[PDB]
Amino acid sequence: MSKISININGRELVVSAGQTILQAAAEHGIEIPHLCHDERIQPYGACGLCVVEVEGSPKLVRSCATSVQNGQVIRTDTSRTVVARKTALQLLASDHRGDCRPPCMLACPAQTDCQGYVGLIANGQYEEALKLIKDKMPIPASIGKICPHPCETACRRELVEEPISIAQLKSFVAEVDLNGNQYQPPMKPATGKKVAVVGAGPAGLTAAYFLARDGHKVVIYEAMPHPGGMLRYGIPQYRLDKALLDAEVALMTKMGIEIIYNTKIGDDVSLDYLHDNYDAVFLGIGSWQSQGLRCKGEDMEGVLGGIDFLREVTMNSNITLGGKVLVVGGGNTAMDVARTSKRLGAEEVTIIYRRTIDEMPAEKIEIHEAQEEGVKFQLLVAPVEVLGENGHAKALKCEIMRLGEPDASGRRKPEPTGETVVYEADRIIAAIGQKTVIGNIKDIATDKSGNIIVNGGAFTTNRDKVFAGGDAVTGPKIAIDAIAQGKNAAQVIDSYLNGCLVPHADSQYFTQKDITAADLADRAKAPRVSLTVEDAEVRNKSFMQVAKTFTEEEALRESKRCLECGCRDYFECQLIKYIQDYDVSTEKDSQVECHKTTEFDNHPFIERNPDKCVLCGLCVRVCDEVVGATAIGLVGRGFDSVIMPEFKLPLSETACISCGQCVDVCPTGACMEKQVSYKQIPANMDSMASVCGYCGVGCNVNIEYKGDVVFRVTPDRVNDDGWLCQRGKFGLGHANDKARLTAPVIKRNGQFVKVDWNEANLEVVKRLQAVVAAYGKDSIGVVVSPRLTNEELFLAGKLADAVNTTIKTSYSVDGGSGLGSVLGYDASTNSFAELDNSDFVLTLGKVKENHPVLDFKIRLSGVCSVAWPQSLANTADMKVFLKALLNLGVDENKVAEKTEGFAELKASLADVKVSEEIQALAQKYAKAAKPLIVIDEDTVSAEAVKLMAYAAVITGKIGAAYRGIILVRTKNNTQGAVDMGFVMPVSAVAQGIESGKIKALVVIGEDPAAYPQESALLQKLSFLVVYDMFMTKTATAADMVVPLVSSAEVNGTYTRSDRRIQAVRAAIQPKTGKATLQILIETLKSLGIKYDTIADVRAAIASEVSNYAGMDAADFGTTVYWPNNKNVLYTDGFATEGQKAILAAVGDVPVFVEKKKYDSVEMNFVNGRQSL
Template identity: 35%
Template sequence: MERIKVKINGREFEADPGKTILDVVRDNEIDDIPTLCHSPELDPYGSCFLCVVEVEGRNNLVPACSTRLTPGMEVQTRNDRVIASRKTALELLLSNHYADCLAPCTLGCPAGVDAQGYIALSAMGLHREAVDLIRERNPLPAVCGRICVRKCELLCRRNDIDEPVGINAIKRFITDLPGIYDDEPECAPPREKSVGIVGAGPAGLTAAWFLGRNGYKTVIYEAMDKSGGMLRYGIPAYRLTDAVLDREVDYICKADVEIRYGVRVGQDIPLQTLRANHDAVFLAAGAWAGKAMMVEGEFETDGVVGGIEFLREKTDDPQPLTGTITVIGGGNTAVDAARTAWRLGADKVIVLYRRTKNEMPADEMEIAACLEEGIEIMELAAPVGIIAEGGRLTALRCTRMKLGSPDSSGRRRPIALEGSEFDLPCRTAVVAIGQAPALDGLTSTAAGELGLSRWNTIEVDSDTMNTNIDGLFAGGDAADDGPTVVIDAIRDGRKAAGAIHARFGDDRLQPGSFAVAKDFWVKPGATELGEITESPRHEVHTISVEDREGSFAEVASGFEYEDNVHETGRCLSCGCVKYEDCPLRLYAEEYEVDMDRHKGHVRKHKVDDRHPYLLYDPNKCVLCGRCIRTCARVLPIPALGLIGRGIKTEMRPAMNDPLAETSCISCGNCIDACPTGALTSKYAFPGRASLSTSDVDTYCGFCSLGCPITVKRFGDNRYHISSGGGPGAYLCRYGRFDTELFIKQKRIVNPVVRSGSQYREVGFEEAYGTIVDAMKEAAETHGAESVAVFASPELTNEELYLAGRIAREGLKTNNIGSFSVLSSGKAPGVLDPFFGFTASTADRTALADADLIVCSNTSLESDHLILSVDVNAAVRTGTKLIVANSTLTANDSFFASLAMDPMRGSGSALWNGVLQMLLDSDRFKGVEDLPGGSEFLDTRDFTSERVSELTGVSAENIGQAAELLGEAQRVVFIHSPDRVQDQAPGDMETLANLMVLLRAFGARADLLLPQMISNSAAMEIVGADPGYLPGRTASPVGLSGARDHEQLRGLLDDGRIKAALIIGEDPLRHERTASYFQNTEFLAAMDWTSTETTRYAHVVLPGSTFLETDGTRCNFEGRVLEYAKAVEPPSGVSGTEALVGLARHFGIKTGRGSAQGLSGEIGGIVRNELGDLVRYYWNTGQQRAWGVNGRLAPVDLHVRAGTMPLAMTHFERHKKEIRNVGTSRFKVQH
């Protein structure tokens, strides 16, 4: 096919016909064209109009996603016109995007600490990760957990319901936990540059932390003999202890930060010397000077002292006080001074404030504590003079005030009342009306004088903390608007560190991130939040007032565990979980959108949380249609659609019903499709936020398809699942959501030994020894045929291989099998007489070009959804579909060319009837000449009347099925060997005969055998079957025990098994299989959660789930899938590791014993024994095409059917319960 030549951005390219502009631009990495509605696996939609480009000769811009290339086309992907159009499109989308990108609490924090994030992590139980998240913006979390003014809580949305979440108390709880400060912070490799910092207060320490972590040699010059600045010398120990502060400073110093104490820059060392010794300097000198009352005699009178001076003095020398102490001021320093004076024994303490308590800038909790401790707050009074005797203060002359109109701070201005003067007797007056920096020696450099403000603070650029002198930065109380609060100083320190890092050319100074906030339109209030249940706030526990008197012991003792659980549970998770990777937000940032341009009416929708696994926030929906189109690919009748017109258009489920009550099958693929977080997962644990995850790619282990998944881990045992195969790689509900089983259910953590009714936890070595001794004793007493090992087909190849070796080498018995396999009633190797092997003859790609697909004994939508997607895709392109199932779904009837519902157990009769009609037709003559043809024909007696009577399917439908098969040239049969619902004796063999017949007469016919349990296909291959050794060679004759399934059933039926090891199965749950163990003398079990079998067992080993175990499994196509350990098992020992340990105690050599080593060992055996057949059983990339016609054979329809179709594994039982009660009603039991 001739390729098309086009010119894009002035460069020539060639492309295949049918390609879109977007395809070629992305294939050749020409530009990053923005899209929201486009996804490669979906047909172009063109709704978002972000991908517009300019095509020469066209008046209008065109969407790149849907515009096909034409010869000679010239395209511009990025010019002023294109950029302006994209910007407008984004602004229009955002004009109706009533959502919070970031939580209000995060926006309210001056340092930008992700409060929602660390609350979520703490709710998950990931407290260390929560502290690490705080440290990304604030290296003093324990300090702030005690003394922060909690600007975050002022904006908490719960204020409109009851009270704000106790954000600060949560912070304190998690930082007080053991081990939080034991690790080493991650730091970049050392760099050549160094930075000098003046002052070890919060601004200086913060800058040092971030610079140190970036690899810079950082030196802090501190005038005092200890670090902390006002944190140590201005905040009393009853609020912040030295131990807590020292712990924070020590951790900061781990980031290669050096603090040089007793060095006063400007006095002991000139500022210019610092500039010469370092590549940058940050001034964080603090504000150590107190502001004066400006009344006569203030500085000459003994007993008048500044607030900072008072607190510093009492920190160093807490001598008792007597008489009345009056504190002038209303801020935190004033309150701290008053509470300190009370603790030092003052007869009376008065706080004198010129406004009312409501206007006091001090923390409300501190004011409340002040009153609780009996301290008087004298409102609307101010000092105007000093009364002294012999130079010693005896009283303050004060005047009464009233409040006038608001001043620049927003508070009402105090006005003195004439003639209201009064004298207030006191021994000491502490003046705490403000602070100012002391900049002696810090303003002059060789490059010039530092710019100072009218408040005598250092002028800085508030975004970068740059001063007017190159390389000199400033922040904290000494800069800009002067003394503020600790969290503001931390903000300044982090900004300065970022600017210094950028200055050195190692990074670009990042502008503020774009974020939409609901408050841009209107502040959500009680009406919008009205359905949220009130939940009382838990306050931190405190010691009694009696215990505080005369003591500087910390007043607040923090939260108990239950308090923290309660408070984290109160968080409304306002911010979007897709904040970090939302393309809409990132494009808005890139194109510098202006939200005000199209601001107007915004629609507000209620968040729909009625689905058990999904959250839908219509406010975030941009009507891209990706969820709708994805749903239509997965389901023949989609559950989602658009309703309304114009601005009232919404994505909603059919009839606007709850999603769980529609045709929704809870696969969650709409979540992966949604670009903006309108559709998100509900987690199986508390806590929601936009959090970074460590991602591990592996495979699902819930059925034999082995779909790729990505495990997105927040931390140990806290993760969620997304599709791991890129666009179009979907998951079913089990793969996406049902790992909640592993999270919610109680796990077996330690080995257990039972003696009578007493259970005792033991170490692994003792458990191994007990199992080996007991089972060997049983074998010696009753013979090797009396012991057995049973293993679940959910296990890895390596675990199954070890189970077989433990049976044959450790116990000298051939009794190795699976209750799950035995319950199916199917003998192994049933297709060997027909094909020479028993496995799928093709892989899933055979469905794409099939002209007929036949589904027998399978309900793809509920059992193998992702295979159903492939079938649906083929049907939409014209492939015909036959479905034979005793329980037809609405989709079966709607989508299939022919849907038949034979009576259960009659599938073999049905397909033999179809086969008979084909034999009777003119096309299929000379069957007797085919291999096995004569013997095959001798057994035929399936008239349409008889078959119709046996199956309940009309002769007309049987004839139609035969007609469709007779006309088809490319046929794929899909049959589930271990699905019990429509299983029938001889059904697989009958389908094999159909295949052989069709192939013999020129058609391509293949059989796919998807199994319900993930690794069923490997049981015979790895030696976990009584009939086969590893490599699928026959079991040796001389070994004791069963040689096939029938013999193993016989031993169980006769009660001859005296000791057993059961791995991952629960036969004691069912009366039928529990009876097998009435005479058992010893039972060992291994599983990941408690079952009836583990409760009865004498020894229990902890097992692991497929997310916790390295190893391989063989999917239904015979492909070997390598599973990665994505999560650590609670026991710390994977199932493979446990079985390796047990095998070694049996004296079995396991080489390195790793999953990788065992996999290589198995692969070598299999390749050596199977030869060319390895492509069907152990395919690691070999070409799979089966080019042989096969052999016809008679089928015995009277063989034993499955007698115990029982759920043997935990997950089998789980799926059965879901089918029984439905998704919307199913709950995982803890």
Template identity: 50%
Template sequence: MGIIRVNINNRELTAQEGTTILKIALDNGIDIPNLCYDSRLKPYGACGVCVVEIDGIPKLQRACSTIAADGMIIKTDTARTLAARKVAFELLASDHRGDCRPPCVNACPAHTDCQGYVGLIANGQYEEAIKLVKDVIALPASLGRVCPHPCETACRRQNVDDPIAIAELKRFLGDVDINNGVFVPAVKKSTGKKVAVVGAGPAGVSCAYFLAMEGHQVVIYEAMPHPGGMLRYGIPEYRLPKDILDTEIDVLTKMGVELKYNVKLGEDVSVAYLNKAYDAVFVAIGAWASSSIGCTGQDMEGVLGGIDFLRKATQSEPIYMGNKVIVIGGGNTAMDVARTAVRLGAESVQLLYRRTRDEMPAEEIEIEEAEEEGVQFNFLVAPIEITGDGTRANAIRCQKMKLGEPDASGRRKPEPIEGEEITFDADLIVSAIGQKVDASAIQELTQTKKGTIVVNDGTFETNIEGVFAGGEAATGPKIAVEAVAQGKNAAKVINGYLNGVIIPVANPCFIIQEDLCKKDFDHVEKQNREHPVVVVPDKRKLSFSPIAETFSEEKALKEASRCLECGCHDYFECKLVNYIDKYKIDTKKISGEKHKRREEQTHPFIVRNADKCILCGQCIRACEEFIGVGAIGLEKRGFDSKVIPEFNLPLNESSCISCGQCVDVCPTGACMENEAVKKQVPVDFENVNSVCNYCGVGCNLVLQTKGDLVFKSVPDRSKEEGLLCVKGRFGINYINDESRIKTPVVTRNGSSLEVTLKEALTLTAKNLQLIKGQYGKDSVAILASPRFTNEEAFIMKKVANSLDTSFVGSMAYNDVSGMEAVLGCNASTNSYEELNSTDLIVSVGNIDENHPVMAVKIKYAAQNKGKLVSIAESKTRMEEYADLSIKPYNSTEFLKSFIKALFDGGYVNEAEVSNKAKNLENLKNYVKDAKDCGEAAKLAKMYGEAKKAIIVADDDMVTSDAYKLLADAAVITGKIGKAHSGIIVVRSSSNAQGFIDMGIKVPGKEILEQIKAGKIKAAVIIGEDPIGADYINAEILKKLEFVATFDMFMTNTALASNVVVPMGSFAESEGTITRSDRKIQKITTAIAPVNGSTVFDNLSQFGKYLDVNIASLSEAAEKLSAEIPEYAGLAVAEVEDKDIYVPNSTANTYGVQVLYTDGFNKEDKKAVLSLPENDKIFVDKKIYDSVQMKFNAYLKANGLK
């Protein structure tokens, strides 16, 4: 193909002919929105959001399906394209049912991720939950105690029973944080910028907290002697202990924030001074003045404002109360005043409210607890006059009221009952009907009629440049979390200002469900809400001690588990919500019929929601075009189109192979995975690149983690095809499995005892040394699963050497290597990449089922260039794409016929082969009597005529004798020892090739025969479960004098062992593995080891007790490189952080992709053609690895393929 030139947005670009506009744009970093595009799939053009303008073409064109032509001039973001995209997004949103964010998050003024931290609590991840809360809230323990929790008011759980106790869970987290040593957020490098914050209340503290995180130097000026604002002086001690508040605010000082007390703005320091001394100023002075009652006598001695009363009580100032206290108001402040008065010893506390109890704005729990403590409520009374004895107020005269029509607040308006009054005697009257801002001392800042500071909406800017204001100073009295939100948002704007740009804070655009009712939750099981333990009234009213206990861990876990998980689990990955916010889409602009279809969830891994589907078709196309299965399709047409499994079967009963590609390509939450945790939580994950730990294909993946849990495994789209099979995609639950062994176990005389790791390892080493000393060479065996790293395998082999045993191998090996017998090396001869350049691929075995990703590689390579032959014992999906499908009788007789046909067809240059191989004549005689077979002849013709051919063999099933004959065929036809021709052995385990290279290669059955014969007296079994696999019974292991099992789970083999040592998962490991085509890839640590030590640590320590001293991974890599010639370049490659092939060297760290280019791995460099006795081509696949066994059992239990 030729090169074309196009111009996109005035950038001159080049591309290959036949490339779409969208691909050219994306390849060059030019963003064009798209929802139905995947570079691996054919263009579809469904979503209509990628439209662009092309000079000379009047209509907008879809970039995903328009092939670029030479000389095209393209504009991506014009008025026309933006308008068209907005309409497209509005239409998509109009029938997209769901909640991008849950109601609790939307209702919280600070948009705290309630669903996120509640879910993390349910999973036992308190540290991660604390961090998530502190991304938004600086004072979780304090706010958890006092917040009136609008999040709970919005909670949809109340459609089932009661809302989630979100505030109590926040309090629980805050207390866990304090008790474990307060989490201090990371602070960025100093910017050199200084910010003054006026006021140490919720808004000021919040603003300072987030500015400090950005690396700015922050100084807080506070008028009072201590920080906290209304949290300290307006909230009684029994609700919020001040030591809790102080501990949380102290985090600011640890972040570098300086606090100056008893400094009042307008008196001790001016706005002008601060504006000159600092790069920015944030004014958050709060609302400290009490609202007036509005009746005569209100200024009399004996009348106090609610805030003044609470402040005096907090500061232990004298308050004359007498015996009778009247409190006016119906909000939480009024409750605090009344209950404080009770604790200060008032004999009678009466509360006056002009409406009824139903209209009281106070929280119901506050009202109930006030009643329990003896506060008397008088409803439908409004003050007319306060009277006194000339020196002090002693009574309040009130008008009786009735409720009329609702007012602007939605509450029924109180109206006077003509001629009806009532008088209450009082020694103290406290007005708690509201607060207001007193900014009279800072007149340079423009103020409203209500005394609040005027600020620009969304930017917090005042009339003075560089001076910002927020919290109650700007909004008037609000709940504390509103002030916290103001402070956080102001910090964001101020940070932008300090960096040269002011970006207004705006609420993101979301899709919200507003038509749900109780019927929609009929399927949810009722579960009682947890309540904190509250001190009995008669006791609690006697002091200011806390009245309620923080949730216990048990209660917190139960309560968190009640969350309905309303918010979309795909929020952090959803492309649609990102575009809706980016393009500021009004999601309610286009209204009309909206689907409401409950989806029955039958698949254990995949969750489907048709009401979030935008009909992009990616899932269908990926399943059909890419994977080649076609398990899903569209039913109906137009508005009612819906993606369904074939024949409308449940997905788990369809032909779905559970690879998860539908999930990976879905741009919304219509197709999602069940995470590998108890509680599904949409959070922003840490992404760690690693390699699948199941079969030897070595698929690249990304482990998505949060704290100490692995939530997801997704394909690494940056490498190769970006594919995983069911094992790599969903086989990670075992990592978080609570049944993992966490402590070593020693069994003596039928009794098991938990011991330390050191005790277990020293006991194992001592017993092995004793047996070696008593019985000599080869009296000890090591059986290990090839799922461990090269570095770990290297230590295992060193341990075997120390124990003087040659019996070190794995149950994963069916037999001795047939490849090695012929070629001199048990390894693939070519790389995966070469499949795309060969003329013919011969697939041997059930690769499609055992190694699905390799099957996709083969399928694509064959479709793009070459031909495909499938040889299998039974029907496989591979034959659907094969040019020739063969299901021979399971005997090597077929392969002998194949070789005979190669000779008969003239495809063997005998003179040339004689120079490269031995036994040619013997081979010719060996096959001469083979029965002629039409299929063998067809195969020979295709293989013989192909200039280049690669055989891909399934090591799970292909026998040693079959390998010998396949290698014979490759040698005699010259289709080996050169690029694009050879044999690829697809291994059963992730590092089987690496284990072979490390010298761990004795077939397990040979070791077991030696155990039965009584030659082997002790065994170390690592990660394998031969008893659980029904290969042997426990009686065989009883022949051994000592057995140690190293594993993650208490397997049947572990139960029959003397010592059991816990091991880690690949997510906790680091090192390298060698995949089936000899490419070395890196395993990266994703989470901290669950047991406190890694597999390498355990093996290193074990080796130390047997005089094998390898203390670190780097030391292992160095020694491995020095001692194993084929890995000589490993240590260098690790430093350079790159993948390499085996063999490699210090001079060639990239390694060799093609083996035998200069002869075979024999002394004379000649292959030794093999003449095996008649045997089977295939054997049944058998799994011995404990992790694979566990996952296979799960698949079987759920009826999955």
């Protein structure tokens, strides 16, 4: 004891002996890199990233393999450790092939996750797609409408056909969620700081949006009547609607940002005023000057700049154009001026440019649309002089150029030859370019081109407390460049306001440049969704929109075409985390070799990529030591070491369980699990903790979802052991099934017709009343499924009581295990937590195949486990076992005073002979001090369970800690179903149906009619209600079907097979409208029983169910067991009437006949296994 205390990295910490230094440092928030360390298995020592320096040791020690001692001094951030980790990471990055991020995202200036929201649209989740888009910009509809999309240039779908329409999808999502429920991001608590933003263009609005989300108070000073910047006063109305821009700015100003219009800084309000009154200042003034013609007579009346012209068009001012207008320039300003002039009644518009069409910096789409609308292009012509009389410009004398040598930028330089041409024009508009003007703002340094000089990456001007960004710094660019600069400056300002200014730096990713068209030649080809463009006859006269937003069918069709280029493991990969932490270059030299694979492993569940393997060996170690399948292994030496299945066979031809533990321990993207959703994606999923709904083992899970789609399930390594199996890892895809029912249906004239919930409730209540009135008591059977929660089962029992019946049963429970007649409670006498302290485990049945996580736990515990032999499939062999145990000298007096009928049990074993193997098993069992018997309920009959109870009772190994019988139930809530009274055998139900006693049946979650005997039985009923998720075989035979929700949409509790009550939480909202508890509550309220919430039902459970005392305030986040919160049963005597174990004779029971699956979810999983 004495408080073992270590000193690491300067701090003094109190730890526990036996722990490694890695665990001890991580418990106290000290981060040490590791790749090959798992705390549940032995150390390996492959990566070497966990090296620390320990005083008294000449060489670096691996903190994953050294246990803590008392008073040892550890340093983790020295020069030697950092050098070793950087060298190791460089060597690892020397061998890695993959795309951390897709080409589309890396081509975007703002690094928007294009793959993420494209793949979220492909899943039908649009609010999530908008939430993903809004992490980078505040105005996605305008940007999606007007972006020149560099992302679509880099799209890899271009190697198959034309690429994905990323901007159109973004505009669709943004407008759909503007016209519906508007999304407001969460905001940090107020910090008490003040930031003044000058200008309300894209940069200023983005900086204000991202500083308000940090908790600061932002005020925007705009010189114009309305916000938007050049998006409002330079973008024409037919390309960008101003209603969209106004609606977005209103959404932003709802968040608490104040915008003050008609306030020009330096002309109306000084910058010193803002410097004194605010904690920071950001300058997003933009470039709001127009370049002149730079020719003779450029100052004459009749010549006006393009920016000024567009501004007067926007403000609905009085302009003069004339019949003929000459636009000088070739960029987007010239295109906008020319097309606005065509709409403003100019009869002929001509564009004067000094180069060719292919040399123009304008977009080809804009040029094509302009040519369609009617503007003529005059090429390779440079203006020289403006001619006019009486001060009114009337002609443009220009020089004729010729193509010359390319410049440094890759464009040919025009050269005059000898020729001039004079063009007649009423108006001459110079759309030559833009220049930044600082105006009257003083003490701000500017470049020779007018741009504000800032410190690169810190966005700081010469004046303190003042920052700059946008077109004021970079000059004229596209809008997403301004948005990116605004967001980066917002981050830098936010860091500065906390007292430590850090500059913005780009991140390092692994990228692939070897992808060619031949590598994608197996992809099918699907044509792009073309844009609906209005005819050019009506476009030339109106300022109406020239294109339409995508519909939902078009958006789904376009989004389902993505190739999913980026790594799915990016948000959880540990290689890229350390690569970016230690700043290792991911660039590759061509003179070194990385192994490239042509792998073909089309396993339906597990994907293996040897190109992304760091050879930590965690997968083979887990599959060997934990699972025990040993389906994969190492092959080779040195560089040629590769992990692959047995004999290089496919993973489907080997002993794989498809558990997915190799996926769960992998630190990189070498092992991934397959997609549960319609199209999986790399995303930060939301996680909800629940329990598995397939086995009685009750493994804890984390459901990872995004909106209303469940994407994956991971083990819960914090609250449990962190293991799963195939049904728990991959079994929650039925939540995403499109074949699930949505509304109740009633059979009229032999057709199912949809009804409302009230009509369905009235119909089922009245029909049950009709059956009771015609046929009296006990004419209704209630058959439930043991997959429902405890509250659902309690309400089903109440419903059975309300319609005057005692036949409550289940096809899966089928009467219990028979342990209740012997001991008193039909439950296991010990918990799973006591499996580690036994010195002998006797396994009866196929525990490994049915409940494999239990076998994982038993194997990792390391105790001696002996399986019951398969050649002893007769009960007479068990009687020989009892005789051999009795001949080994048990205490007859204690078992005589504690049991009933031990004398007859001794008499019936009088002439029983004992074989050699039976003697060996009995000696092994009776020798051990604390043995456990683990009985698998699926493959073991009731008499074998009774005989194991007899052995444990007569030996004396029951009713104590680490000694007794563990019984593993078939379904998740079989224990809860047994506790609520669903213990009637189904032979009684079949006999009552065929004898005319039972006329109606209520089936909840089961499918008995998949087999012909029960189907012909159900054909003789009078009425049948089926509560199920799918329209299965039984629901087709019903007179009424009511839908049920999946386990990812329910709140409740499940009782484990070791009597532990666990909380089940709802990941996603119910897709049918109502949950099962609500349906049962409404029906019971119709029948006359009043419950309101689940708390009332839990109080009723605690008051009525005998052994569940304490469920009202149990706090199921901790461990709750129902008998007095006790792990061990019968510590004070058995639960029978006389407090004695009832030992009675058992007949000769032949070899077991395998049981059937009646739950619809189980058979859905089984049938879907064959589909892949």
